[PDB]
Amino acid sequence: TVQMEYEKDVKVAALDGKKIAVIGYGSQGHAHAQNLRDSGRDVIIGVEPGKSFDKAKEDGFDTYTVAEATKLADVIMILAPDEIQQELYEAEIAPNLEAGNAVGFAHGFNIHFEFIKVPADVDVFMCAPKGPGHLVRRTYEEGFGVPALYAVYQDATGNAKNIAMDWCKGVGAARVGLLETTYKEETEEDLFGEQAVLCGGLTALIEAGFEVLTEAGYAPELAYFEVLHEMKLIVDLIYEGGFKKMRQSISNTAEYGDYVSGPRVITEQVKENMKAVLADIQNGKFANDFVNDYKAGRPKLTAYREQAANLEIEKVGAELRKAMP
Amino acid sequence: VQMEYEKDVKVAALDGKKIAVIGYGSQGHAHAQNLRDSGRDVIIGVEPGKSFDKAKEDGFDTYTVAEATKLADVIMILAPDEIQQELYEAEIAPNLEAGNAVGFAHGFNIHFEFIKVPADVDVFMCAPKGPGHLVRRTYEEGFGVPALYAVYQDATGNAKNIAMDWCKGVGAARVGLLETTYKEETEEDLFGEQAVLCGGLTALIEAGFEVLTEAGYAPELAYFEVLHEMKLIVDLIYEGGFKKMRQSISNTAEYGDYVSGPRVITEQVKENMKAVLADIQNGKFANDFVNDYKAGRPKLTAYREQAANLEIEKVGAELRKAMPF
Numbered sequence A: 001t002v003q004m005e006y007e008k009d010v011k012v013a014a015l016d017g018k019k020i021a022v023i024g025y026g027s028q029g030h031a032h033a034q035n036l037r038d039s040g041r042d043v044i045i046g047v048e049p050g051k052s053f054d055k056a057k058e059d060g061f062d063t064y065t066v067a068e069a070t071k072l073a074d075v076i077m078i079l080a081p082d083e084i085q086q087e088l089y090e091a092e093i094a095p096n097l098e099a100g101n102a103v104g105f106a107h108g109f110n111i112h113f114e115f116i117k118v119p120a121d122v123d124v125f126m127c128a129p130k131g132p133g134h135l136v137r138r139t140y141e142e143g144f145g146v147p148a149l150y151a152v153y154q155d156a157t158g159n160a161k162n163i164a165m166d167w168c169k170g171v172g173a174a175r176v177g178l179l180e181t182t183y184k185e186e187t188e189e190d191l192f193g194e195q196a197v198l199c200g201g202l203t204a205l206i207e208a209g210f211e212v213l214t215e216a217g218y219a220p221e222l223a224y225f226e227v228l229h230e231m232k233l234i235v236d237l238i239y240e241g242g243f244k245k246m247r248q249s250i251s252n253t254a255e256y257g258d259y260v261s262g263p264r265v266i267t268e269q270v271k272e273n274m275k276a277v278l279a280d281i282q283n284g285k286f287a288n289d290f291v292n293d294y295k296a297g298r299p300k301l302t303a304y305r306e307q308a309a310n311l312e313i314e315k316v317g318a319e320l321r322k323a324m325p
Numbered sequence B: 001v002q003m004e005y006e007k008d009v010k011v012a013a014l015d016g017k018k019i020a021v022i023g024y025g026s027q028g029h030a031h032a033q034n035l036r037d038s039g040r041d042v043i044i045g046v047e048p049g050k051s052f053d054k055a056k057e058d059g060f061d062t063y064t065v066a067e068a069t070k071l072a073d074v075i076m077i078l079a080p081d082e083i084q085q086e087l088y089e090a091e092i093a094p095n096l097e098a099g100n101a102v103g104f105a106h107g108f109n110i111h112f113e114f115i116k117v118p119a120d121v122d123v124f125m126c127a128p129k130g131p132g133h134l135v136r137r138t139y140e141e142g143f144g145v146p147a148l149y150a151v152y153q154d155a156t157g158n159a160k161n162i163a164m165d166w167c168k169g170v171g172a173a174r175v176g177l178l179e180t181t182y183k184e185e186t187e188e189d190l191f192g193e194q195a196v197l198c199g200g201l202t203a204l205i206e207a208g209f210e211v212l213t214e215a216g217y218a219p220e221l222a223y224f225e226v227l228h229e230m231k232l233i234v235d236l237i238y239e240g241g242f243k244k245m246r247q248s249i250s251n252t253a254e255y256g257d258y259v260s261g262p263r264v265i266t267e268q269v270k271e272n273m274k275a276v277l278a279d280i281q282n283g284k285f286a287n288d289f290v291n292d293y294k295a296g297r298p299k300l301t302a303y304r305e306q307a308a309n310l311e312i313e314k315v316g317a318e319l320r321k322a323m324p325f
Helices: A029-038 A051-058 A066-072 A080-094 A133-141 A161-172 A183-198 A202-214 A221-229 A231-249 A252-265 A269-284 A286-297 A299-309 A310-324 B024-037 B052-057 B065-071 B081-095 B132-140 B159-169 B182-197 B199-214 B219-228 B231-246 B249-263 B267-281 B284-294 B298-308 B311-321
Strands: A020-023 A042-046 A075-078 A102-105 A123-129 A148-156 A177-180 B019-021 B040-046 B060-061 B076-077 B102-104 B124-128 B147-153 B177-179
Touching: A020 A029, A020 A066, A020 A299, A029 A161, A029 B199, A042 A066, A042 A148, A042 B102, A042 B284, A051 A299, A066 A080, A075 A080, A075 A148, A075 A161, A080 A161, A080 A286, A102 A161, A102 B102, A102 B177, A102 B284, A123 A161, A123 A183, A133 A202, A148 A161, A148 A183, A183 A202, A183 B199, A183 B219, A183 B231, A202 A310, A202 B231, A202 B249, A221 A231, A221 A310, A221 B177, A221 B182, A221 B267, A231 B199, A231 B231, A231 B311, A252 B081, A252 B182, A252 B199, A252 B267, A252 B284, A252 B298, A269 A286, A269 B147, A269 B199, A269 B249, A286 B249, A299 B177, A299 B231, A310 B159, A310 B182, A310 B231, B019 B024, B019 B065, B019 B124, B024 B040, B024 B132, B052 B060, B060 B065, B060 B182, B065 B081, B076 B124, B076 B159, B081 B284, B102 B159, B124 B159, B124 B182, B147 B182, B182 B267, B199 B219, B199 B311, B219 B231, B219 B311, B249 B298, B267 B284, B284 B298
Parallel strands: A020 A042, A020 A075, A075 A102, A102 A123, A148 A177, B019 B040, B019 B076, B040 B060, B076 B102, B102 B124, B147 B177
Antiparallel strands: A123 A148, B124 B147
């Protein structure tokens, strides 16, 4: 069991008096740093020279290099892409850590799969808002926020959980709901969800439907609406009220078709396919494949991206979206 | 096929026409209210009284289905697919006159020939791609929902102009119209909802949820990873296709999408979809749906009760209760 937690469950204001460095100033970094400052926390930014550096000083943040920001900080939150974190950590963060420091991530990939090992006299925590940077910043400004997972990988000080929860509170997530997890569970469920369902499964399902229709001789423009455009309405309904609300709102013909045909398409064998996807997440195979592709100059990602640029549903879709305000 | 707009509606074919909307659910109310706002002469045909009264309250001349038809030049049937044949035979057909026009928002009954309209009467379709609530709402905002239009039989020579002018009257021509046939609209619409939008999607999500919970992961967290976070992804696809979605997610998620999507949705799944399409084309699904209705909805009953006991539905309801927005 696990109960959702809120501001009243943040027992200790553990970020009190802490010097906070956010590493990276992309959308994610910006949202965290800005939210914490508005909450009333001492935030500085650690990023390599460039546009983000300049914008960081434009926004009024004491901006330093990654190495120096880590030197100054009690709490260091690393918000950079997974594939560059190991290099960045080893070269700029690790030599500038001190005992009793705390290092945070928003996703557990590098820590869980042990591409990064933080010294054992240093806390490692996680606050993982379930939203993109701009939504994390915006909802905070509007007065609430985006819900989040929190976790602790290693607790050297005894303060790590309180730091994680206070970070969550500081970025607005505690205003709407928190769920405690582990680094292992967050990492494996997050990878599995996006691969089997949210991104991989979904786009593949859409593409397969589009192919069946267009290959059967139906017009691609019309197929676009029937497998893609109208999905927003459906998912918005599920988001708000689950399968129940969605199926109430659609016609009984559609509802009946849902019940009857859903299981013909997504079968036991498909569920087995998902189990194989989960297995390669648990055993480290996917993680190694991704890092290896990155190290090799992204050749698989390159081929995937150029292929996806040439999909008929993507060309037709671009034209149709152009033709609609 | 090219997208068409208000400028492509040559003739205001609904000019001087007495219009009856049959049915006053969300669909009926949306069409009727939009057309009245567009200045059309609209009456309502519906049984007493829990729809009849709401119609009268809204200020419509409201009659029985039989009497509304008798008065009307154009009759739009906006009742559940499964009850249209009975309603048409008993109340509508006896009150048609040559040169009348009968419309539908979905081609189910006409295409599968559960209903046969006399050869001196036009049969047209305007099929907005959204629920009634949405069709009315967007209209009030000075916007609209895109629509398909089609003609099944054209006795007067005016059927296409009638269909397009209906589309225009309900606000659809403000955003975009696509011409189709009754056959392609019916078959593509049934296939999309069954294989992808509703059936495929809910089954995909449920399978993901099962895999996670059966592997020992917490269901609260599984809810977010296969359902809650899907809205963000689909909003991105709605706005900019697979391309925009995959630009916006992490490179880790994007790579996982490309690699695991095809592992889950395979050639065999595509074959499963082809079987779904076939049972739509050959009329087997249509007969199954109507036969379930005639038998007192026993399959729908069992399906609905099973769906109410889904763990993802119970957990999701409790989680959505714990979250405001």
